[PDB]
Design a protein around this ligand. Structure first.
Ligand code: HEM
Ligand code: HEM
Ligand SMILES: C[C@H](O)[C@H](O)[C@H]1CNc2nc(N)[nH]c(=O)c2N1
Ligand SMILES: C[C@H](O)[C@H](O)[C@H]1CNc2nc(N)[nH]c(=O)c2N1
Ligand SMILES: [Zn+2]
Lengths: 417, 417
């Protein structure tokens, strides 16, 4: 309250002192009188994007941070690089990051992702430099290697692939897909929706672009890639590269008849990675699933597959009134299966209990070595059984540190010719 | 973003415009660069409490609000009351609220409780004026009537009992208990803890004050009441007034052997109610339980009864690794029983599904008639199955409106003689 902020865990009484929040460079969207802590989404006006004049301050901020990290703040190399980048900016209206800085930048962007519970792994990130890429077909190749390297035959590995930074002319690179691997969604005029409802619009775009949709329940969508600002091009991901897992239950043999399956590689590909002021509008990244993402959100959200109803009658659950908590029951079994299935097929996965416990272990390490750890409680607490996971009882300070990942508008909303 | 704030429901796409946040008078604890949205707890320095000079502005703020509510802002009655209260304050260094203002004040304090999911009922509040009370025995009688009126033989009714306001000498009134009805907690030097661990310290205080503890698992604690600032006095609540419910399962007949029971009346009694600047440090209030409060928090929290383990072996659940989600399974059954039991015993209760659905219906009504509804997502989303309740997907603006309920320090931490 007075000087430095404290966070307490109401299950263990542990109190931690936070000093890192003072490093905040971005705004939370909150004010002294309002809290937007549960708000999902808290170009430009002058130029189409950032400006050469405002770039160097942001570059200096990162470099200074960078050289401090390696304990060489104010050294020749540090002072030299600074002048060096100052020159590049004046000359070209931008600058290129060294390989080592790009790696530090990406890892720390992950370390600063307040909404990610899997941050105990932030330092094992494998960075793939795709800054020399120039065409969509080029992007496709870099993405295929990512998936193959990341999937690693079920023994998942964290990785991110960074494409060319945004500029002032050559346009930018974008993976139009929200995730590298996702299923299509079809809406019959019958009101019903075959597949993922969250992907209906994107699917419609793929079909208008020539995609010959198979009209199935679990049809993997084709990559829609944009390079150097040109029209996006369709690419089928090599099915041989897409590791999938059929969902069965370790007790209910009737579960398999639901005909459920999910892909093992979660790869977010619509976010923007910012480092030293440079904007990488194409930086697909991936780690591994936490069971609830699939069992709860993907399968049970009313707006998603919404299979609770279907899974309810199968169990013969009392669906007269919610008081029977049939929904709650159907929910647990679905998540037991998802975890059981992945673990049988030897595909990397983590249950919400081990995941949250690890995040807690991470928070403490960070408070000890870094003086804090920005965390978004609303995103960190699992979408089920929140109360019985260690993070529900953990107070969390949320703030924006840089480098960082950010949201960006969907490209099809402003693409031409 | 630009002018007025918007909130969107990501499950229905519904977007609501919030204008009520501009009515914020208190601070959230958040800044443009930090979010304390998950912080539990975000006297005085000069005087022991508030001051006569700062009281009239706060009184005027409330009265103005009050007369606006009844559509008579700026009328004779309004202007007269204002001058009238201005006089009382100068003369006595405080003022007395009219009955009608106290009622409006208490109902709106509830309407403004951002952390309460049961707010669709805010207008049916029954206010019991206990401002003439002067002694602890007097408090005991007012509390017994509250419980009896509130319990209503299982057909619960919302109510609050307001004791004398804080002053500058005659000291203040406090119900030392966190809740009117709660169970004791005993800590054997064997490390084990019989009863509610959250009540161990309070229990120890009751015993030092003369309470002859029965040393049982579900021993209702004696009321510890403080009046006019005197030492607190012990009172046994009439067992005949304490409605209890034995916990059984509608399917698992072995559940009853766990020997579980809980009380049907949840009554918070350690909060402070502030209206027009007046502070009521003793205002026990009550409504009815939402199943999860008991089934999840009271029974399953590691720091509470923590009966998951015990309930695990009974079910013969696979407790080799959390991946089996045995905890999650034990959790659902426990909550099915709690709800089943209360509904069998005809004691009012609400499941998290109907509760959250009603809160959503309430938010929309408020946005329509009041222009908004402050809500604390972190408290509104249930401690289990969050994702499948409508509120998980509902963005919520949090802000502090007055009148309101506030936290206060525990009295035993500063009581003398
Ligand atoms: C190693 C395994 C990892 C696990 C288990 C993990 C887990 C999670 C979970 C459960 C979420 C919630 C996503 C949602 O609800 O939509 C999340 C969010 C996020 N994770 Fe991690 N993560 C991992 C790897 C990664 C990697 C490789 C990066 C980047 C280097 C990263 C960046 C983020 C970001 C930025 C978000 C926010 C996404 C958004 O706001 O849409 N994560 N993560
Ligand atoms: C009519 C039935 C009601 C229901 C179902 C209901 C439900 C809830 C729930 C589930 C919580 C969470 C408590 C916790 O997790 O500790 C809560 C908090 C709260 N409710 Fe309500 N409530 C009701 C009546 C009342 C009444 C009568 C008042 C006052 C007039 C009120 C004031 C509050 C306040 C101030 C909190 C916050 C308590 C704290 O921060 O410790 N509620 N309520
Ligand atoms: C740390 C965190 O704020 C704390 O555990 C909160 C979370 N949400 C809650 N929500 C409700 N209804 N009740 C609580 O006691 C809590 N505890
Ligand atoms: C409205 C609210 O912010 C939204 O539903 C949030 C809540 N918490 C979440 N948490 C995670 N991990 N992922 C999500 O998509 C969400 N959705
Ligand atoms: Zn906030």
């Amino acid at each position: 309250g007075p000087r430095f902020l404290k966070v307490k865990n109401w299950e263990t009484d542990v109190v931690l002192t936070d000093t890192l929040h003072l490093k905040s460079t971005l705004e939370t969207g909150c004010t002294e009188h309002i809290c937007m802590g549960s708000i999902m989404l808290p170009t430009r006006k002058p130029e189409d994007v950032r400006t050469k004049d405002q770039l160097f301050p942001l570059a200096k901020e990162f470099l200074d941070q960078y050289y401090s990290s390696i304990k060489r703040f104010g050294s020749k190399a540090h002072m030299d690089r600074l002048e060096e980048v100052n020159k590049e900016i004046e000359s070209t209206s931008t600058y290129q990051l060294k390989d080592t800085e790009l790696i530090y930048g990406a890892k720390h962007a992950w370390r600063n992702a307040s909404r990610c519970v899997g941050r105990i792994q932030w330092s094992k990130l494998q960075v793939f430099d795709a800054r020399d890429c120039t065409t969509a077909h080029g992007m496709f190749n870099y993405i295929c290697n990512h998936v193959k390297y990341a999937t690693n035959k079920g023994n998942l590995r964290s990785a991110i692939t960074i494409f060319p930074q945004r500029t002032d002319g050559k346009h930018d690179f974008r993976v139009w897909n929200s995730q590298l691997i996702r299923y299509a969604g079809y809406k019959q005029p019958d009101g019903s929706t075959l597949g993922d409802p969250a992907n209906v619009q994107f699917t419609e775009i793929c079909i208008q672009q020539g995609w010959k949709a198979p009209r199935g329940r679990f049809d993997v969508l084709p990559l829609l890639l944009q390079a150097n600002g040109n029209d996006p091009e369709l690419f089928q991901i090599p099915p041989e590269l897409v590791l999938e897992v059929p969902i069965r239950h370790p007790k209910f043999d009737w579960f398999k008849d639901l005909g459920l399956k999910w892909y093992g590689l979660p790869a977010v590909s619509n976010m923007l990675l910012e480092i030293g002021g440079l904007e990488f509008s194409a930086c697909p990244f991936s780690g591994w699933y936490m069971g609830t993402e699939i069992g709860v959100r993907d399968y049970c959200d009313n707006s998603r597959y919404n299979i609770l109803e279907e899974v309810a009658k199968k169990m013969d659950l009392d669906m007269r009134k919610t008081s029977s908590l049939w929904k709650d029951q159907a929910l647990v079994e679905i998540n037991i299966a998802v975890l059981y299935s992945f673990q049988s097929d030897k595909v990397t996965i983590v249950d919400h209990h081990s995941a949250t416990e690890s995040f807690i272990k991470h928070m403490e390490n960070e408070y000890r070595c870094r003086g804090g750890c920005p965390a978004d409680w609303v995103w960190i607490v699992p979408p089920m059984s929140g109360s019985i996971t260690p993070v529900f009882h953990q107070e969390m300070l949320n703030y924006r540190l840089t480098p960082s990942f950010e949201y960006q508008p969907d490209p099809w909303n402003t693409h031409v010719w």
